[PDB]
Design a protein around this ligand. Structure first.
Ligand SMILES: [Zn+2]
Length: 851
């Protein structure tokens, strides 16, 4: 009742104020749809989206499959009044959940504030509303009334789980990128969610649930509202600017296509893939675009198309863009204030930050792709609440995110058919049949490796700089934390919103067309690779078995588990395979099962400590035979190979890191001035600290995108490998149990859910170790294989500045008579020592900092 003020029903009578048949900007002529105004500037249309796009009227599956991990198609969805009512209540509920958090409260306020700019006038001294930023509200009497708005929530198009921000474009202006902003139409459904898998939280939660977890749809909505946020303030990054990936190697993906805008919206490490140069380019770009709005507001003389005054309208956009105004009435953009507003919309309003506030399990990267799709019902309070989500307090579902777990909370999630086939998009990995014949496995596109292009990483480190006494000292960029979010919250003006002012009627049908959007080419599909050796993907495939009818499964230690469907590979000792494959009689069964649970824990809990490697203090030897690391199929060979060559042995590809010759400093001399001569020397020295900081940050960015992503995938694959082992073990134990007759009843009394629960527990404990080990390798690599490159490049820069400052001091020794000896020592001391590399300065991730 805080954000949404009325408790709406779909069958409520049309009134023409908050419940009315409306008409939106259209290519042709549309028929009115019943819509609901949940808040000021925010409307909801409980219909399938068939009107915004003239080419999207059909709700059937497209001729071509479409390149997404998970998709769902159902034309019958959102046709019944019951469905539309439940949609309206669902969307309303999620708005309340977003608002109930400190961060969501801020976001929703910023969205209402972000009224699209009145730049539809051809005469540059008049303020006129852009017609596509409005809707026509039809009254009970028959007449219509045009109204300004910021946001519209519509149901999905053909693909039900494809959520996105849409907006209508101008013929000449780029409204979402010029600072103006345009009305946002979000395609969303609260009746479906994504199924994902996570294993990173097991450190804090050892009793974590088994299978797939469900994405809280509030997070999803908040994600789309952030996209709307950027777009309303016209600060959205060009959809052209995509993160280009290498697609030629066998281990690489066939293609991904992720926009910078997407990585920015997520936050975490994902936002840090974008380097300092490109990020500064964007910040300075929208700084000048805001200044253009300030210029147009100073040239504005009269207002047209509304009863409201020019003085009021200028004030609205003053509040929106946080402009400073003189007593003379002139507007300007404050540098420090814009940065506060930009950082907020860019770095504070992120998906990862919302997770903090909701206290829910969620994907930690964008590259943690969805695996399934579930039908949900969040409207009943017994199922979902504004405060707790799925994870209801004082219930079984409170601890370890149990409410989000598909298997424990199975009555809340019904698994649906993924319309993307398991091998719709794939590479084909082949090997010599043991080339007269080949043995080939299909690997799904999203099980492959990222591998970003070098084109995505640009810098101006080579560019020289002229040091003066007036040289600006960059304030240390404070990293995102809850303390900072708290500070923005306290400075926030929550009361007072922009008003719903009466504007003059537009034409009966608003003529509008959606934003152009770049035409993205389809990836090459089904590429074949003929390989000399078995790969990681083969070893992972060998551990898989047909879930269905076929039973008799026998575990073994050779990768010819690929040949026989009854044979499944394992990396556990030969004693484990002998024990599990042993025929057992009813009398011996329970003691045989108890002993297998024991061995399963013992094989997986194996930890070998070391001090020889450095940076890496622990090792997990069975990762070698589990994934074929370095083509050395021995537990002894993995431990030995890791000590010898370090973390690089885990990597699928060696990242290229290009640091150029660092731009030297040039000094500006001032004759007969002792004060400003000392200032320039001091300015050059503290500007060197920024240079060390700049390089360090650049290396952290490359490591975060090229290396840490690889390790991220290996841990996910180890989680899969362990799950495969438990499944195979359960299948064999359950097969033996079903081979008995009537002695199953009382004599045994065996619970498979208990066996599954105990094995899941042992997997979690194994992952605790594995996560700890693989984090060390990622950082180990950063410290010994990536940072040194920058350091010796930086030490050569210190050499150039050393002689530059010593010659400078010498050349001005008549001006600095009494201080020459002192200044000579400071230059010699500070430029001889390296600046210590602190990981906590560039990486906020506190579980990466745990090393
Ligand atoms: Zn997105």
């Amino acid at each position: 009742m805080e954000f949404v003020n009325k408790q709406f029903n779909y069958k409520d009578p049309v009134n023409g104020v908050d419940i009315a048949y409306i008409k939106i900007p259209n290519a042709g002529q549309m028929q009115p749809v019943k819509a609901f105004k949940i808040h000021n500037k925010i409307w909801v249309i409980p219909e399938r989206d068939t009107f915004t796009n003239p080419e999207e009227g059909d709700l059937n599956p497209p001729p071509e499959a479409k390149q997404v991990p998970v998709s769902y198609y159902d034309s019958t969805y959102l046709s019944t009044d019951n469905e539309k009512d439940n949609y309206l209540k669902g969307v309303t509920k999620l708005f309340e959940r977003i608002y109930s958090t400190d961060l969501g409260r801020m976001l929703l306020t910023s969205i209402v504030r972000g009224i699209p700019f009145w730049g539809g006038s051809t005469i540059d001294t008049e303020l006129k509303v852009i017609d596509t930023n409005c809707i026509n509200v039809i009254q009970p009497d028959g007449s219509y009334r045009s109204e300004e708005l910021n946001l519209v929530i519509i149901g999905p198009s053909a693909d039900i789980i494809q959520f996105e921000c849409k907006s209508f474009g101008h013929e000449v202006l780029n409204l979402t990128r010029n600072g103006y902003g345009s009305t946002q139409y979000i395609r969303f459904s609260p009746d479906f969610t994504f199924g994902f898998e996570e294993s990173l939280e097991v450190d804090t939660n050892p009793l974590l649930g088994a299978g797939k977890f469900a994405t809280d749809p509030a997070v999803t909505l908040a994600h789309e509202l952030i996209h709307a946020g950027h777009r309303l303030y016209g600060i959205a990054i060009n959809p052209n600017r995509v993160f280009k990936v290498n697609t030629n190697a066998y281990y690489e993906m066939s293609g991904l296509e992720v926009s910078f805008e997407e990585l920015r919206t997520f936050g975490g490490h994902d936002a840090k893939f974008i380097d300092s140069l490109q990020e500064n380019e964007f910040r300075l770009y929208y700084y000048n675009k805001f200044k253009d709005i300030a210029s147009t507001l100073n040239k504005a003389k009269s207002i047209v198309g509304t009863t409201a005054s020019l003085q009021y309208m200028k004030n609205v956009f003053k509040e929106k863009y946080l402009l400073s105004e003189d007593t003379s009435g002139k507007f300007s953009v404050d540098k420090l204030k814009f940065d506060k507003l930009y950082k907020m919309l860019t770095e504070i309003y992120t998906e990862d930050n919302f997770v903090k506030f909701f206290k829910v399990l969620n994907r930690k990267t964008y590259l943690n792709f969805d695996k399934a799709v579930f039908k949900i019902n969040i409207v009943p309070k017994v199922n979902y609440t504004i405060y707790d989500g799925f994870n209801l307090r004082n219930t079984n579902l409170a601890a370890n995110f149990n409410g989000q777990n598909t298997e424990i909370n199975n009555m809340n999630f019904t698994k649906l058919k993924n319309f993307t086939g398991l091998f719709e998009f794939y590479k084909l990995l082949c090997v010599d049949e043991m080339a007269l014949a080949l043995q080939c496995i299909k690997v799904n596109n999203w099980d492959l490796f990222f591998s970003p292009s070098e084109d995505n990483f640009t810098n101006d480190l080579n560019k020289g700089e002229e040091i003066t006494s007036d040289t600006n000292i960059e304030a240390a960029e404070e990293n995102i934390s809850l303390d900072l979010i708290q500070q923005y919250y306290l400075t926030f003006n929550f009361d007072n919103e922009p008003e719903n002012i009466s504007i003059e009627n537009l034409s009966s049908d608003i003529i509008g067309q959606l934003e152009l959007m770049p035409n993205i080419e389809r990836f090459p599909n089904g590429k074949k690779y003929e390989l000399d050796k078995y790969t990681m993907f083969h070893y992972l495939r060998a551990q898989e078995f047909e879930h269905g009818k076929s039973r008799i499964a026998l575990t073994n230690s050779v990768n010819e588990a690929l040949l026989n469907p009854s044979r499944v590979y394992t990396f556990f000792s030969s004693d484990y395979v002998k024990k599990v494959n042993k025929a057992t009689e009813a009398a011996m069964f329970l003691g045989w099962v108890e002993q297998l649970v024991y061995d399963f824990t013992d094989e997986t809990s194996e930890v070998s400590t070391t001090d020889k490697i450095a940076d890496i203090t622990i090792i997990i030897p069975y990762i070698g035979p589990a994934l074929n690391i370095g083509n050395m199929l021995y537990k002894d060979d993995f431990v030995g190979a890791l000590i010898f060559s370090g973390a690089v042995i885990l990597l699928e590809f060696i990242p290229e890191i290009a640091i150029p010759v660092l731009g030297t400093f040039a000094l500006v001399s001032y004759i007969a001035n002792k004060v400003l001569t000392v200032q320039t020397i001091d300015n050059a020295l503290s500007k060197r600290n920024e240079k060390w900081d700049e390089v360090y940050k650049y290396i952290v960015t490359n490591w975060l995108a090229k290396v840490n992503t690889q390790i991220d995938l290996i841990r996910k694959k180890m989680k899969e490998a362990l799950e495969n082992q438990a499944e195979a073990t359960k299948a064999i134990i359950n097969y033996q149990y079903n081979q008995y007759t009537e002695e199953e009843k009382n004599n045994i009394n065996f619970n498979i859910d208990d066996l599954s629960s105990k094995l899941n527990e042992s997997i979690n404990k194994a992952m605790i170790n594995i996560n700890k080990f693989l984090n060390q390798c990622s950082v180990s690599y950063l410290m010994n294989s990536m940072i040194p490159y920058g350091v010796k490049r930086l030490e050569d820069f210190d050499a150039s500045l050393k002689d530059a400052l010593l010659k400078y001091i010498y050349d001005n020794r008549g001006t600095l008579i009494g201080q020459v000896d002192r200044l000579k020592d400071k230059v010699n001391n500070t430029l001889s020592t390296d600046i210590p590399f602190q990981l906590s300065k560039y990486v906020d991730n506190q579980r990466l900092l745990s090393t």
